[PDB]
Amino acid sequence: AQPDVMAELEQVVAKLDIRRAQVLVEAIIVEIADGDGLNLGVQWANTNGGGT
Amino acid sequence: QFTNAGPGIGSVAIAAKDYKDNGTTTGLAKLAENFNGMAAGFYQGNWAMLVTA
């Protein structure tokens, strides 16, 4: 381009070529799980009387 | 005989007569698979009674 644009492109480039900063990203995924089943049940079977 | 009840006296009686002299248990064991409650039989002389709950 014209020397006028060369000097304009030279500032654009210098701004645009800036050392892009780096990012360290730690994620922390914590899960905790449990639970309590209970099955208690009583059956009475009698020949004479009846069964449950 | 009714149906709302877990099992029918039919399958029970037949199974008990089929379980005699070391018979099978498949038939009867399949009836009693999902049953849940108090099946109480009573014999006063000749009238048989089956209560389901």
Judged by DSSP in three states, A25 sits in coil
Tell me the chain B residues in contact with residue A41 when contact means C-beta distances shorter than 8 Å: none
A37 to chain B, closest Cα gap in Å: 20
- CA distances (Å), origin B33, targets A7, A18, B36: 91, 77, 9
Residue B40: closest CA among B53, B24, B51, B26? B51
Which method was used? cryo-EM
CB contact under 8 A, B51 and A52: no
The answer to whether the beta carbons of residues B26 and B7 sit under 8 Å apart is: no
- CA distances (Å), origin A47, targets A9, A25, A40, B26: 103, 72, 24, 21
Residue B2's Cα: distance from chain center in Å? Answer: 13
**β-pair partners for B43:** B48
For B43, residues 6+ apart whose C-beta sits below 8 A from its C-beta are B49
